[PDB]
Symmetry: D2
Subunit: 406 residues, 4 copies
């Protein structure tokens, strides 16, 4: 309470107010909040003393920004991406990085729904023509979504939610996934992607970024799609062969697309964007905003404030992006934690401290990653016995950080 | 049917195939079908011997066209509008006009939902920018539709269906209507319009064209809207003060809008479109396509073919736009019908014909409308007797037209 | 009004208070109300001067009763059935009889839901045992209804509503009807009844009484049913061969049933009930209370009172069960009606009156049934002319009743 | 499954076939299956060499049976109850006991829906009467559930779900809970129980068994229920004062009830059931079958089999009922496991074994109960070496059991 006051959180790039509400609720009130991103002078000054930093996608925590922060304990990316942070550099210093990979789910699902509705109707091309003074009223080739088949590639957090939405609108939902998934509602798994692509009126992608998904929608897959169908990518920028898509659009094999993510994207809103897709009025182009709503920001705020509060209070590195994952349930007693290089005899040295000197260990959870190790230990002991054990632990060679949590 | 197969149907402007499937199923297989609209000296040609014509918005049935069409029995507008047809000229020749005023409801409702999804998310602005190479990634001001209030003005065919869909997406639905309607699901009627406009995040208009609705959305009504709300108009082009809309968009009191209908619309797709709204990237402009889908064309085909078929077969003029509405249930025997100027004791003359011939009249329905009268008569007689009766009927002063239906 | 105060409504057997509220709302305050049925004495004294009578099942309006009713204009059966009324006898006096055939829909549907839920779970039997002190706890043969197949025979007013409710509980809904129906929700028409019976976990019958449905669930059909399935009949008493059902229950081919209607039912609640089904604890037996709820009573009260009121106020006989159906839209002016035997010259006499009185007819709707005729006429004429014309009409040979409605 | 075939699963009392499907799918194929329970020598005979046993409520694993079960490794109760197992005899022999704590939420909720539908309609009494040949057709006091107010007491797993079903049926949902909960759908939390009771047409209980809950529905609370209402209890047998309920049934303050759980319940199905409630035909009495369905049995089978497989395969004791909870993520290498008396120095002796052989400990998770500890250890080492290590682990003082899992 007087000791949570010392614990500074630096929050930048205008994370959501529920982050700050979670912090204060947990007794953390020493907060330096900025709506904007910080130039370097300002970042380095504002971070020198910060125990925690929370950022979004534009703050760039390089190797050297990290070095400079002496108090820094953990990093929260209040967003999905973590490229902006040097993860090895943080890990080497016993600094876990957390993010929010799954707090954008509903925002993306609703986007795909709005977009496919308008695409099926030719509304993008008509709006584009209209704003340049061209009237293009017609019914031929425009369609209601009700009764049409949505083909969802990757039936995960978002695919799943999308399918539910689609069915509320009276669409028929099929999915393809590399795993066998349990369908929700009257969703149907399709074993082969070629089949999914043939049958679907709209195909939407909801997959990870990896070898298996890199240009998985190429010319072959695009031509397996139903004539006059529609492709929607708000997953990842590497999943569609964009030139192949341009050819399908130009040949009218597809009637439209909505693309929210691209192979290359502007670093800031000041930076110019270009895609060969720009020439097509029947394509919706959006600036990676599939998850950009206030509702999503809010879910993020809570989730990542939460992750940091829990690391701080009980040492949990569950979900950490660059760190051994450790979490122990809270069963009272005292809790210590120890971050280290995996040198011979660290663990030996640790349990020697307690055991040699009376102390029962109630619980212990160690996890490692290459030459990083992290262990959380619960002990049944006096206050001063714990404080002494801590000092001993800090001296074990290879020790990066040790802390008495409670 | 060796009579029905000589009843020519002229269908123009590529009405939906279901129109024709209906006709044929009903025994009417003599169908001259055109995908386009006809020049003059081929409309005159094709319609000279046509007993029925089905058309859409582009065929102008002027008085001259109508009076040169010798055999013309009825006219179907396979569309909402009837402005393209001279209804008085048709009436004066005993020719009923039918249309489809409510076959487009799911289409208009789905458009609005797609439009409000994207408007709430700033996507129209972003798309426009992106095609110009400007990247505008932000969450500020962007919202999921779930949990938001939709205010519907006009809780009729479309307003109702729209609220149902919105509720499916987890919106909260409210409506203002001048009449008191039973709500569907959890919709709520708002008594005062001021109160509905105050609470709404999105307001959508589904009202008829008249005195009560002309510019009902002026500067005053717009300013009562919640700051940062959205206005959608896919009802009628006279309902919104477009200048005052521009005011509120420029001032940023509204965050966007979607306008599908305008005070003055272009006559063809080759005529140019102007609006002050063309300057706002955050406005969706569409060319009166709210009901322009193939599924709507299907509904229209079925409906208006059904109205023609029924009139042909049984004399029903329900929903006729320019005629007294008569419909008589079927009970066998013969049916005859009489269209006449409204002079008195036409009914007298008629009932006299049958009394003299010893024919019992089983049922008879007369209705009158303006300077005009229409009666359908069920009698119990054979062929010769009914034909002889019919020739007598044709001879009555003020007779416009008469037929033996069965 | 001095008009309506003369117009006595005799209501017996305790129709819903909403009927009284409707009447009084419509200006009709002369009401004699009885909770029970009347003895012969009280019935003849009470109906002598009645313009309308509302009754239910028990009141027998025989030829002789009806002949004593000097003032009687119409009969309303505040129920489905009309056998308690001599309809030809009412017809000969020009007294239309109305009823309420579809006011019970929700109550029947809700009952089938409750019954199938408890049956699938073996509750009728477990409850029966428990009351006699036997504890029978088991999971074997008990099933949740979610994910099960309900087969509906007769997809009309009740079949439809039932399917909607079942789908709300996560059932799959299949139906067999003798005519092609449009499915609601995800319901599915099965063309062959044998297939529906093969697949269904619960079969429920919602068909009319006629040659086609007489013992249509016989031994054959019940053996086609799925093993361990359940049969529900709350349609009509003649539809299931009950001895065959008993055999299927005893052989355990079926796991239970719920019967609300029987080939022979008690006339009154004092009369004993017996069914060979009484032997089975896994059968729900109910005393024809499928439609017997206060909400149903209420719906009936509004419907039938409203039918009476419309006949009185505007002459409509739509849905009359024993009478020519006529109704004309209300377009102001004055309105006369004329009930008659179909004597030669009635109609020509009607005009002659309007000619020599100078009255222009705006609409006229005649319909006949056998030697019974009914015509409603709208005229443009002041009061004293309309009144003169009315007197002339009452004197046409074969006139049964003539009235000026407004 | 070379070495897995030696791992004998004994399943008694007819667990779902889904449990065996899970086992076979995990390579566990040596299964002794029984539909019933086993008598003593028959039990001791089958269990002696079993590595796992799956049972339900009737099989009593006493300290004597447990201590004779030579090869026994874990216990699966395919049910919620665990009192048939001596949890310490197990723990002290190093044997985790697993159960199924909520695999029946839908079954309870559906039961309540079915019950209230019929109670509202007076069907339990009509049915009972009908079977005795008494016919009671009436509409008085019978009600559709639609529009009625359901009052849920205890808005947890089952309460929540029940509210969702009820809303599907057009009911209004209210709940009382000792904590603030987030309502689902249009459910409404009521702060004072007395207000819930006064307003509810049907009251259903879904609370735990503790002192806050014992006879919480007493005379006072029932007297506060709405005159004519229905009480339902499928929660716990201690929660309703049963005599007070009988008073209220007899006085007709309540129109009916449905009771599934009783202060005292028959031990088996051949022991007699006694309740003053048996006199009442408008009470549904069921033998604690709220969660007794095949769907529940199937979920139980999956859950509890899965828990035994996971313990066998990877040593997870998550959700164990008598044991420290440990679960370590799989990351290859070898895994060992150690159960021991909770005393300082054990972990020190373990870690010393690996240090000596020059083997790195990749991860380890120790948790302690009161008297005992359990630790899972991941090492990077070949077969030979891990085996010599296991040998040494077994020899630590206080070791109860140790195993090389992979
Ligand atoms: N555009 C945006 O603003 C935005 C916002 C949020 C998330 N996303 C992205 O959406 C994608 C999906 O998100 P999520 O939360 O649903 O992910 P998820 O992990 O929950 O699901 C991804 C699914 O893809 C399946 N899958 C993996 N490889 C596949 C393959 N080659 N073919 C087919 N299916 C495959 C997986 O089995 C999994 O179910 C991610 O890349 C995520 O970062 C984008
Ligand atoms: N843009 C398109 O392509 C397209 C397509 C189909 C229909 N429409 C138009 O949309 C409108 C609505 O169609 P619909 O079938 O639902 O209409 P509807 O006639 O069924 O309902 C109109 C509703 O407005 C209410 N109302 C009338 N005046 C009002 C007033 N001034 N203020 C508030 N409420 C008022 C009425 O009570 C009624 O409920 C019509 O103008 C129709 O022609 C446009
Ligand atoms: N138990 C009760 O208290 C009670 C109450 C109200 C109604 N009912 C009865 O329930 C039945 C259904 O009522 P409703 O309002 O739904 O009637 P409905 O006419 O609207 O439905 C009957 C349906 O059955 C179909 N059908 C006719 N013959 C068939 C056949 N032989 N095989 C299969 N389908 C056939 C029809 O096409 C129609 O759709 C009626 O008999 C009615 O009197 C009973
Ligand atoms: N009939 C059966 O065969 C059977 C089957 C399953 C469950 N049950 C019983 O159902 C009951 C509820 O099950 P669940 O899984 O929903 O439990 P749950 O713990 O999820 O919910 C209990 C709810 O009760 C509330 N609560 C506790 N004490 C209260 C009090 N005095 N007043 C008001 N609210 C109170 C809690 O806040 C919680 O929200 C349990 O007793 C359970 O064992 C019986
Ligand atoms: O938060 C940002 O600025 C980026 C949006 C986001 O969630 C991400 O993709 O990293
Ligand atoms: O049909 C037309 O061509 C005019 C507008 C329209 O498409 C419709 O009436 O539905
Ligand atoms: O009318 C009755 O008295 C019994 C109920 C009935 O048949 C009905 O609801 O129509
Ligand atoms: O123990 C059993 O056999 C099942 C009992 C059960 O499911 C329950 O008590 O809810």
């Amino acid at each position: 309470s007087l000791e949570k006051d010392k614990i500074k959180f630096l929050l930048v790039e205008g994370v959501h107010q529920k982050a700050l509400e979670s912090l204060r609720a947990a007794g953390y009130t020493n907060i330096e909040f900025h709506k904007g991103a910080l130039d370097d002078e300002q970042l380095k000054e504002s971070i020198r003393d910060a125990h925690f930093i929370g950022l979004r996608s534009r703050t760039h925590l390089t190797e050297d920004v990290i070095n400079a922060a002496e108090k820094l304990v953990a990093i929260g990316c209040f967003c999905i991406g973590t490229n902006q942070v040097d993860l090895d550099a943080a890990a080497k210093r016993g600094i876990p990085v957390f993010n929010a990979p799954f707090s954008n789910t509903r925002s993306v699902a609703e986007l795909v729904i709005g977009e496919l509705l308008l695409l099926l109707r030719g509304v993008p091309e008509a709006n584009a023509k209209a704003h340049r003074g061209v009237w293009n009223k017609l019914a031929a080739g425009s369609f209601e979504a009700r009764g049409k088949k949505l083909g969802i590639i990757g039936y995960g957090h978002i695919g799943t939610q999308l399918g539910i939405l689609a069915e509320s609108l009276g669409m028929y939902v099929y999915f393809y996934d590399i795993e066998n998934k349990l369908p929700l509602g009257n969703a149907t798994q399709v074993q082969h992607l070629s089949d999914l692509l043939n049958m679907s009126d709209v195909v939407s992608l909801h997959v990870p970024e990896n070898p298996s998904t890199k240009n998985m929608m190429g010319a072959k897959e695009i031509s397996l799609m139903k004539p006059g169908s529609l492709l929607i990518n708000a997953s990842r920028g590497t999943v569609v062969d964009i030139p192949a898509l341009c050819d399908a659009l130009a040949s009218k094999h597809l009637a439209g697309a909505a693309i929210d993510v691209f192979p290359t994207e502007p670093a800031t809103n000041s930076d110019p964007f270009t895609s060969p897709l720009c020439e097509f009025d029947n394509v919706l182009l959006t600036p990676h905003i599939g998850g950009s709503t206030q509702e999503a920001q809010e879910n993020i705020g809570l989730e990542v404030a939460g992750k940091l509060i829990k690391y701080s209070d009980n040492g949990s590195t569950l979900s950490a992006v660059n760190f051994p994952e450790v979490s122990l349930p809270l069963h009272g007693g005292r809790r210590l934690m120890h971050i280290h290089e995996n040198r011979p005899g660290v663990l030996t040295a640790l349990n020697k401290i307690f055991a040699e000197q009376g102390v029962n260990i109630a619980a212990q959870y160690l996890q490692t990653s290459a030459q990083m190790g992290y262990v959380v230990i619960d002990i049944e002991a006096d206050e001063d016995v714990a404080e002494k054990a801590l000092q001993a632990m800090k001296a074990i060679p290879g020790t990066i950080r040790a802390r008495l949590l409670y």
